[model samples]
Target: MTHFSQQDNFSVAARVLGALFYYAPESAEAAPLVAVLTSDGWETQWPLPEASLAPLVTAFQTQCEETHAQAWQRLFVGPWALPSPPWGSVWLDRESVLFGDSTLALRQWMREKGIQFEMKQNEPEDHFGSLLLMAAWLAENGRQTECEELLAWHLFPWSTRFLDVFIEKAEHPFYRALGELARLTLAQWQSQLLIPVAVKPLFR
Candidate 1:
């Protein structure tokens, strides 16, 4: 189980962003972010299926007053599988990249700077959320330089491609917006790189 502290707002923000990016809008997991964003008057340029989003919004409103534990369960349980999108070099590489070797290379780089993944051994080192957790952890612990390098080298290259697929194929407003957000954030990250890569369009 992942630990949460009263101070850990970034992780909360990450999970909310993740829920919108991955799950059905009316899904138990996505309600919180959807409700929050909607209330804040986030504009919607694209059409959203509001009928599909209604149930989740209601649930989110009801649960907003609940304890964190109660709100947390609705986000994580009832379907543990939806939030995961299988991504690794194996997704791009013909060979199945076991336990994330490409990511391990980045970890070795981190080791040169005295950084390591702190969770249980069974926990994987490379996954969308896990890597974000690692970045957040490193930043929180004041390892920003190495964390930035690791983010650039290990996560962004392949994740951008995945976001391309996500935006193109996901038939929902949630993923569409999330995909654009992903691309914009990636562009920002790429610009900051000491050696920038040529990022090309994935969809026509």
Candidate 2:
């Protein structure tokens, strides 16, 4: 009786975490997720351990008191320098350039693998948000091999660096909780999936 299925856990985690990172806090994609997470009890549905969930609950509860007014805007979509650039190229490509070698590589890989993602124009595919969403779609649709590849090659390489900086600079409890949750979940994901990751030249 194997109840803790990979698809059930991984897909849900990816979708929630991806939307949280990818969308504006007020966007329809993130708004409902933020609402549910800010309150208690969401951890019951989340697949992570009880030990990890406790601190995340507290972090989200802190959002109730300290509102996330412009945290997402300042951190993600910014005129100012972003706390962490959300694209993989910033870390994996030469000179920390966007749409560079790694981004094109990801595009080529996606094309080769027959995974097509519909997203807003002018945004690169290697964004952590998009990559997570891509992983979620793969996992949900029973493409575990590709999901594993996406995590191994695209996400595991640079997520720690990005999330480390993002969590430190989040300036809001919501994103702090979100980033930490992603960190914990991805740790578990790697453990469970046995993902072999890449060694990229991290420029930032």
Candidate 3:
């Protein structure tokens, strides 16, 4: 019961942070989240400490709406190449194909987890931000073991490498801050969850 109490925080943290990166900033999905994230008191509501949020707030507040939208396009919905491909297949597969064989394993896991996973429309299951959105759901439902397996198998493999590139290449402060914050947030969950060494032979 005590464990469950603290677990709720991870759900909130994952949901809010995941949406920021998962959806286009101008999209309906991200609009309300952006509204609150840029509003006062949100930093305090975040699971991280007050001081850790100061820099992120600065980045979020300093940007114009257009700037924010532009950043989202370049990062997630590019006419140009992305700073990092958000999908795991690009990073994990030898051929780097979408819906690659590696992704099949995750789909099977979802199949095993049943239809309880809120399915997305035409979205790849291995999208970095999408996985975080899924993580929030798993946490919310108290699917501790399944959630742990998801994090260890899917997220831990390539997220660190992807995030580092994202932080470096995200020209806009807002998105860069989001990238950095995601890493920090991931650090907290990784330590708390005690996911064993998430190693794979591939690091591309």
Candidate 4:
């Protein structure tokens, strides 16, 4: 495991690319695929767990190839799935969850430091990918205060459920590996943010 420079240095693009590579699939049948492909190039090289990821990688690739449009759509996206606005709160929390309008409340400390969100609407606010991209943005821009607030108030609140649905709905091994990789990355991220630095290296 690699230790990030700080909690904010966590890599959304790398996690997605790693999953896509380890799983060996062109795409998963889920909304998250847009994020995965959007960050990394279509044919980017990814890291693989030669020992653990083999079976899952093969399964995901096979599933994608054997399925047709309807099969692919239903399997990947789910029958009730939409490209954006996947969460109940996006419709419910226009102030906080939807676009982080109330993010200023949670982000009050950060706001006082002059950090803020770009608030782009290119995708749904509740989407995990969007949250990650938001994190990546703050990280790249060196907005540590706003980045911290975003993770606590926006990303972590929903990622556990996202990971649960990922494992529950995804059938391919590759996608599972991808999911696992993200989980592991997030677990490390979680431990670092929630605990003291004295214990951070062990978790990573």
Candidate 5:
């Protein structure tokens, strides 16, 4: 048996979470990744409490592939209405619009940290999955301070509300599971950081 360190767990969570949020389950990169999540093996590597984690595990176990894809499309990829917009600015900016003030602020912060990222689409820098990737990048590079700040200043404030709404409204099992995992992971980040997430007004 191999012993995994706390940082290793964070990295795995970050990578898996980032992929799930950034790509549809059918995509080349996301398919196998999603498959791993649907099985029991992943549970052994995950460190969170089993009770809080059960819903997600059960959701994945019982998921239908086609329905999962549709749910992913409705929730994150949409030409139609999205139940929740996945950008941080939607919830944090006063105007509650994409590419809003919060995105700019996050961009400035990333610039200060010398972090550069390429988005698959022309989207705001503060997209939910992008933030998770950034957090993972920070963790992998030993930028613990930056990771903490990323959660506190950028991701944590808006993610809780967005994910809770996502779980409630997502009709497919895969996304509901994804939402649960996201919520639990963010909560874990907050607990580890020992910092309070300050409340911010959400226009939407």
Candidate 6:
């Protein structure tokens, strides 16, 4: 029942997911952002059905911002071992190391496509957050073919596994909600585009 354009939905999702994935909830801007997402209009604007995100909405409504921030740190910005590593190369490469061959492959692919952008962090290019942001950019800029390529070739193979593990293992409600959001949105995207995902072996 969304009145918004498809492109509007894509842009909103991209910004929300990018921030949720990459920014700390305790940051100055995060609380207000979360507030907006939990507002009544959010359900109307977002792509997924309300039932699909009820748990996420509930979590945002019930959980403290501090808890959200802690969960983000534990899941993504850890001194401890991450239960679900965010780098696509870790899941895709045979060696299962950071900055693995898959990362290089994605980097080369981006280079060939002229999709150059500086990383906000010192992490590898294949990080889930960065890839989500890139996908959003492609969608917004009318690069539909390239967006399809990003999903089918670069992200889909390993992202399924990464999200599955995260959803199952994450102790915090916020991250679990994020896992579901990422999974459902990506699945919806695939279905909407009807793009064939190339089979690729996941090392993780």
Q: Using Cα atoms with residue i matched to residue i, what is each candidate's TM-score against the true structure?
A: 0.55, 0.93, 0.89, 0.53, 0.91, 0.88
The residue-level lDDT of candidate 6 at 68 comes to: 75
Highest TM-score model number: 2
Q: What TM-score number comes out for model 4?
A: 0.53
Q: By how many angstroms RMSD does model 6 differ from the true structure?
A: 3.1
Candidate 2, backbone clash total: 0
lDDT of 2: 0.83
Best by lDDT: 2
* Model 2 per-residue lDDT tens digits across residues 1-204: 221225557788899999988998788899999899988789988888777799889888783544564888888887799988999999988788989899888899899998889787988898898889888888877787788888888888899999999888887888888899998888777766554677787888
lDDT of 6 by residue, 48-117 (tens): 8977777677765566545776788889988999999989888888889988998898999999999986
> Which RMSD does model 4 reach against the true structure?
8.4
Over 1-204, each residue of candidate 3 has an lDDT whose tens digit, in order, gives 343314548877787778888887878988888888778888887778989989888887775655788888988887998888888888888888888766887888888878355546876788887888887788777777777778888887788888988999988877887888889888777776645847765546
Model 6 poorest ten-residue lDDT run: 1-10
Worst 10 residues of 4 by lDDT: 195-204
Residue-level error in angstroms, candidate 2, position 185 = 0.5
Tens-digit lDDT string for candidate 5 (1-204): 221213648877877888888888889968998889888867767768777787678878884656667778878878787888889888998888889998898889999999887786777888888888888878778777777788888988889999988888887877888888888877877776645666688877
Q: Please give the lDDT score at residue 31 for candidate 3.
A: 88
Better of 2 and 6 by lDDT: 2
Give per-model CA RMSD.
9.8, 2.2, 2.2, 8.4, 3.2, 3.1
**Poorest 10 consecutive residues of model 3 by lDDT?**
1-10
CA error at residue 120 for candidate 3, angstroms: 4.9
C-alpha lDDT of residue 62 in model 3: 77
Instruction: Report residue 143 deviation for candidate 3 (angstroms).
Output: 1.1
Residues 1-204, candidate 4: write the lDDT tens digits. Answer: 323414333554434532342222344624365343334333223232345434444444444554333433444355776322334244334432544443334345445656454433453334455456556666666665555556656556555555656666555444455566566656656665642322111100
Compared with the true structure, all predictions reach lDDT values of 0.50, 0.83, 0.79, 0.46, 0.80, 0.77
